[PDB]
């Protein structure tokens, strides 16, 4: 029915100090299969 | 049922878009003869 208060967008949070440290882990173990000096980057799921 | 939907009561800026639609329609009550006129709220990802 009615919405009481304000119309705000639903969101999620992760800690930037924690999440970037975890991507620092998975970019090390990924170099074990693709060799060193390999510029690993991420992107945002092209379509679907 | 063919709904009838307006903007939710909100400060409509041109940059944002309406996330919640009003959608007042007709629906049968528990009696088979009468038809109440009820309203609801619906997300934009549920109405076309």
């Amino acid at each position, epitope marked *: 029915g009615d919405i009481i208060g*304000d*119309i*705000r967008q639903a969101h999620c949070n992760v800690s930037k100090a924690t999440w970037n440290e975890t991507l620092g882990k998975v970019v090390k173990q990924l170099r074990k299969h693709f060799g060193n000096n390999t510029i690993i980057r991420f992107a945002n799921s092209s379509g679907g | 049922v063919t709904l009838q939907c307006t903007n939710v009561t909100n*400060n409509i800026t041109d940059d944002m878009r309406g996330e919640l639609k009003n959608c007042s329609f007709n629906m049968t009550t528990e009696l088979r003869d009468k038809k109440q006129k009820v309203y609801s709220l619906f997300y934009r990802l549920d109405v076309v």
Partner: antibody, heavy 132, light 105 residues
Framework: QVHLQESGPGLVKPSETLSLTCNVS????????WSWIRQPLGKQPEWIGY???????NYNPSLKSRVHLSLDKSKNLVSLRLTGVTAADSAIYYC??????????????????????????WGKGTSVTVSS | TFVSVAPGQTARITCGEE??????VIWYQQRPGQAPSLIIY??????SGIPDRFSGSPGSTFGTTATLTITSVEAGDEADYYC????????????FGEGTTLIVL
């Protein structure tokens, strides 16, 4: 010190390009949000609009077409202009200084706030009437 | 829109619609014959020069009305009060609210 000296024709003929200026005192026109307020006779006052250099020139959408606010940095002057005044705008006018301020109510990154306004000090005003 | 309170008591001025979203009211004071002034410039915060006896209502509630409470009413409060509400769902209010006069005995 802050105060606002004004002007005015007072008795104006209808369907005429009404104008009104408002002087300064110490502070310059370039460094304050400038707003204009009309108060009808014995009624609640009505915000005509608010003007500033660099973009902030948003008007009241009720009139929206016959109003034109403008600045004068050389004379250190603010100015109001009305085009084609009818017999309903017979009221008093006010030039005023206003301060802004944002009230966040949610995430600041999702544009979930607004910038309100409030007029701390006001001009003395003038009665600008239209009749025959 | 007339409230008659003899001095020494308190007064409550009610203006504006019901609280729809998160508000930020602006309260003014109109001297008779003169130009209006300012009392409250947020829900409760006030500028310097006025006393602490003026107060306001918080705008963090949904379903109330923008009140204006005055303790220790004196003879200088015989003026005209105007609310200027800024709700977060209705658009910009270019006219002020219901002007109530607070006449003191």
């Amino acid at each position: 010190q802050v105060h606002l000296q004004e002007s005015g024709p007072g008795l104006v003929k209808p369907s005429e390009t009404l104008s009104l200026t408002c002087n300064v005192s110490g502070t310059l026109v370039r460094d304050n949000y400038w707003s204009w307020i009309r108060q009808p006779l014995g009624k609640q006052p009505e915000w005509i609009g608010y003007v500033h250099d660099s973009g902030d020139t948003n008007y009241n959408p009720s009139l929206k077409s016959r109003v034109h606010l403008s600045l004068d940095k050389s004379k250190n002057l603010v100015s109001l202009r009305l085009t084609g005044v009818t017999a309903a705008d017979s009221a008093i006018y006010y030039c005023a200084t206003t301060k802004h301020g944002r009230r966040i109510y949610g995430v600041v990154a999702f544009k979930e706030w607004f910038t309100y306004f409030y007029m701390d000090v006001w001009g003395k005003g003038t009665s600008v009437t239209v009749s025959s | 829109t007339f409230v008659s309170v003899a001095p020494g008591q308190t007064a409550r001025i009610t203006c504006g619609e019901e609280s729809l979203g998160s508000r930020s009211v602006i309260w003014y004071q109109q001297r008779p014959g003169q130009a209006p002034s300012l009392i409250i410039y947020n829900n409760n915060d006030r500028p310097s020069g006025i006393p602490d006896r003026f107060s306001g209502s918080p705008g963090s509630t949904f379903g109330t009305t923008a009140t204006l409470t005055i303790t220790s009413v004196e003879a200088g409060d015989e003026a005209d009060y105007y609310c200027h509400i800024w709700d977060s769902r209705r658009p910009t209010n270019w006219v002020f609210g219901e002007g109530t006069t607070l006449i003191v005995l």
